[PDB]
Symmetry: C4
Subunit: 360 residues, 4 copies
């Protein structure tokens, strides 16, 4: 007989219950840990995708207190220049008071690498990257683990994120190899077809839950990567135990993402594509892709998007009565809902006529 | 691991079973308690929203036996005038025989307040408001509870509704603070985005059930607020234990609601918007507490509903559906309805079967869309 | 806490499992009981609706082995005339499964409401075979008192009573002496009872519960409403119903009352709830429990019935059942998911030809 | 009422990732068609008159799988199709290195028959057919069982597939009659209306699981037939224990399928219809059909489609850590998901602007 080990839930399946609150949303603290050694002033990371994060997006994310991860779909020299552009970026101290800086006052930045890319690691380390994001479609693999061990052997103090994973066994294996954070998410991304092409993945809320429980044993933070559609999803991912959230599609239509605006029938758009899409590909992986190429609406500045996102997170913590993220995770109580309950939660039986800044 | 405490249901998840019946829908009694000390002659309240209830909707809701709550997105002077217009409203006794009146034969009216607005309470009391509705996005908060206590210490005989809540613990805290009713609903409203932007909420049927079980220990009525789409939802909310129902979207397209009619492509509409939408908050009379750098993060949207005619015509269909439900259950009145009610949980397929299906509608029914 | 007594299923929630079969669809037998005393040669009844059944539809339903129930949305004189037109209709080699009474006349049913004893008298005098006591809520004092007064006056008049959806209701009607119960609160295509009133029971679970109770009295169950496809007929009978009442699938036929009309190059006929405004203009300005609509024109009743009964025969062959009783003894269901339902329908292909039994 | 189980199909479940030391390009995808016939990849083109005649069967065999010639033709014509495949086979050796060949280096081919068609069996055997596919709407029937026994009595070494079935009891009865594989699927096909017209069927993932557990007792492979819409479905069907997968709709719009292209509103299509549709019909079964007639987009060559399907299977096995199909089945662990989780799995909150070769909405 077939082994079903779990009925797995994702964001749309659950809601947080309200709790007794003595805190206002404006007063809660949203600092969190990116890795064992790197703190964020707010829990958002822009994805390592060639339509989301290069130096300009990374700079704004760091200025607002989070982080950008420079994607690796470029040569080593180019990715070094991108990292250097962020590090050398820093009126602003009054303007961006929550900026996420290293010990020398420089904006923090991350950069993506792949299996076996030690040459790329050497050059990113030399450029002053704060953290390396070892990215694979399948982080629970010999290639990833061997790469973790080689990097730690050469750079014992380099903070290392590794992913992506979706199981406790994967979290345990990466933590035992010495990673400083695990990135959780197999298939949930907006542009991702891994689950359809390969049949493989875990609904994101259950994946986070399972991996947090294992990673917590090692004191290792979890990055919840992909499938975030609304500010409420950020709140749910953090409440179940993730320490930070990686976001692609919500940031790809911003001014600061790479690529130019274009108009299609009166409305403005920006391209957004999977890094496993055919166009992006022009270790683990004619090509058989695991992502699509598409477009998202133009939404203005990263700052305006992040403001709405973090405001939804602050409202959530106020509803739960939480003074900060760890208290949020201690207090969090979830309810499983039905499709009808989801219909009820969205706007219904009313035709929207003005665009809400945080709801589409 | 993550703590899931229950699987929660809302209206479309459940149906009432029919029972043995000796009563006709036209004979059942639909009087109910608004608060510990205020009865209604029918169980409907119009929402405290600036596209639903000012004096004219409140007058009609009370004349038909229910209640309107004047919204608070206006200065104190204006809200006082709205309350006084309702109080001074009163052939009509033959015309509206179920009118909901105070001890002096005046139509009853409620008015919304926010946290820490004691000046507004003072002036509404002087204007003769029958009940104050202390509304917050999060009623289970120190600010709300401190306001309950300060109002009761100053006005021990003022009936007080406090909300919104969705848990038994919240109902217990408000009841222990001395409220006269609790209002239940976090997120279910037609225009509401709380559950999506914040991730927080409880499906409305389970929230009523859980809050009724707690509030009943204190003899405190529950107002089921938000998410009502059809008259059958009113029946389910009352059957599961709510004493009354607050309705926004279904009343927003009426003659009596504020705002003007407008035509959009051969059809008539009226605007309907959340009180936590941008457009509602941009007005400078919206003092906010829990919801309040620069730019606001809304919890609702701005939209339109079709024009539906008079409040009376809408209420007639709504109460007709409730009477039909009680007839199916065999219930002579609301309390009997709640004692007899038995539910079944249904699937999506069962929901599809319940609506109209496999037929193209060509005439518009007054109670189904 | 709220009393949820069960999680109730309807047709689309379940499938029949195939079983070992030594019978071909063309040789299974589909005779069944309408009442304790009236047999059918096939298990279909046309609904008592003023867009479905008057004499012409009832004649064709009886000729094909089933039954029509003349609706009651007419004065007593006209319903009498409609019953007589069926009774005096009579072809024998053309309709060899015709459902006839002891004198070789086509069987017919007629609907009545609470308290309509004058109507019952006249229908009895016209030779009606079975009276269908119809109410939105059959589990009521008014219905039960009408059952007892009819049986007191006409002890041998076969009587159907409904509609019900619970075992308690089935028990009460059987204890009053009905000859069949009609099950269905809300499932009808044109019905809004469940939306307007919040009341109803998903139809597969309602049949199952009522059949288990009615069987104790030897009383057949009529499964009324919600039938979309021939497979729904198979499920309803397999779960234990003795017969099936159908509205929307027969409203588009030549024989149903009403003119064909054309709307944008296609042909339609009206189909409306009997609790809709249009139809209404005991238990029930009016607050309706149904809508007024249209269904596509589908040709003759005979062509529709042929496809419906072919699906039933196919089902019984899949299960290995020689006849209806055997079908009900062999029947095993699986509950399926939404994905399983999607997989069951036609998927990932654009249909280019209209199938006679699927849309 | 007797509800035996809550039955799931493909979209209800996902495979969990596992620890992996193998790359998708290195896994092995050979499998058993029958007790006696091997495949070099697990795909079979369906026995449908819009999917498989000689040209599609040649390509399926050249790529390592199999084609089953449909039986909607007289015996002479089906013999012609079978020997056209058998006679199809130096630069081809380098071109098709995974070709599925018999003991004499000829491409393998299957052919479909119905109940009581012993004349047709005689002529297919004489034409050198490798395997006969006894196909019925209801394989768990006296007619099918008696036909199995009569074919084995006359041709003891003729490999015989029989179907379709969806229960463990049906798998047991066929295996006890001596079949060499069972074909599983009652109702899941893209064009099929069996479940709607008859009310009968089992969601395909549970049907495979149930039938594999029984057939494994007899060492008999299971062919998962119908309902495949994406390469991940192939992976799930195999991981739950099927030995091979039969595909119709995904191959009907190819160059090699019968029927020519036709343009409809600036796009190219091919016809695809159930073999129980009215058009295809014009033992078990005016006619009452169990299928529809429709069209599918034109997708180019079979080879291109198969390449994407097999790449999805390889990616799946790499995610699970499986070196081959048997190991894939030993390692496989599923989660049940919700419709929300299904929505999350597909592309969401992005409008697709370029068509992926292996994904369509
Ligand atoms: N392999 C599945 N997905 C891909 C693909 C692809 O397959 O082509 N390229 C990126 N990803 C993931 O998607 C996330 C963003 O997700 P989003 O915030 O837009 O929902 C990213 O952070 C990645 O973890
Ligand atoms: N925060 C969620 N909802 C809001 C919003 C908003 O979001 O901005 N403004 C009002 N509400 C609630 O909605 C009910 C009406 O609901 P309805 O009858 O239309 O279903 C009202 O009675 C309020 O309780
Ligand atoms: N009260 C709910 N429904 C009504 C209505 C109405 O609502 O106005 N008038 C008839 N009915 C029922 O519907 C069946 C047909 O169902 P169908 O075969 O079309 O699915 C009939 O046999 C009736 O039992
Ligand atoms: N009886 C249900 N279906 C039929 C029909 C029909 O009834 O008309 N003719 C073929 N089938 C099945 O469909 C599969 C293809 O399925 P697909 O790959 O397109 O999803 C075929 O391999 C058959 O097993
Ligand atoms: Cl730090
Ligand atoms: Cl700058
Ligand atoms: Cl490199
Ligand atoms: Cl800005
Ligand atoms: Cl104020
Ligand atoms: Cl008889
Ligand atoms: Cl669902
Ligand atoms: Cl071999
Ligand atoms: Cl032949
Ligand atoms: Cl090619
Ligand atoms: K809502
Ligand atoms: K209905
Ligand atoms: K006619
Ligand atoms: K199908
Ligand atoms: K996805």
């Amino acid at each position: 007989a077939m082994k079903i080990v779990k009925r797995a839930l994702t964001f749309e399946d659950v809601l947080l219950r309200p709790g007794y609150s003595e805190v206002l949303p404006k007063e809660v603290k949203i600092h969190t840990k990116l890795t064992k050694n790197i703190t964020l002033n707010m829990p958002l990371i822009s994805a390592a995708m060639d339509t989301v994060t290069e130096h300009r997006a990374a700079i704004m994310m760091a200025r607002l207190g989070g982080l950008g991860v420079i994607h690796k779909n470029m040569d080593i020299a180019s990715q070094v220049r991108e990292v250097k552009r962020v590090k050398k970026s820093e009126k602003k101290r009054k303007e961006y008071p929550d900026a996420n800086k290293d010990n020398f006052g420089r904006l923090r930045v991350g950069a993506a690498i792949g299996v076996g890319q030690m040459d790329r690691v050497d050059a990113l380390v030399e450029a002053g990257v704060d953290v390396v994001v070892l990215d694979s479609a399948h982080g629970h693999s010999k290639g990833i683990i061997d790469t973790v061990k080689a990097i730690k052997a050469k750079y014992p103090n380099l903070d290392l994120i590794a992913g992506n994973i979706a199981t406790a066994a994967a979290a345990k294996a990466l933590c035992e190899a010495g990673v400083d954070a695990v990135k959780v998410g197999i298939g949930p991304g907006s542009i991702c077809t891994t689950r359809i092409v390969s049949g493989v993945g875990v609904p994101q809320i259950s994946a986070i839950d399972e991996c947090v429980e294992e990673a917590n044993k090692f004191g290792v933070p979890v990055i919840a990567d992909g499938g975030i559609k609304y500010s409420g999803d950020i709140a749910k991912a953090l409440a179940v135990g993730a320490s930070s959230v990686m976001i692609g599609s919500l940031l790809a239509g911003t001014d600061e993402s790479p690529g130019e605006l274009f108009t299609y029938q009166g409305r403005q758009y920006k391209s957004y594509r999977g890094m496993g899409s055919l166009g992006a590909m022009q270790y683990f992986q004619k090509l058989v892709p695991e992502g699509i190429e598409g477009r998202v609406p133009y939404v203005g500045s990263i700052r305006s998007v992040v403001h709405q996102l973090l405001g939804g997170l602050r409202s959530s913590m106020g509803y739960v009565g939480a003074k900060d993220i760890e208290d949020f995770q201690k207090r969090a109580e979830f309810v499983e809902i039905t499709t009808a309950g989801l219909k009820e939660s969205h706007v219904h039986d009313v035709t929207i006529t003005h665009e809400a800044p945080n709801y589409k």
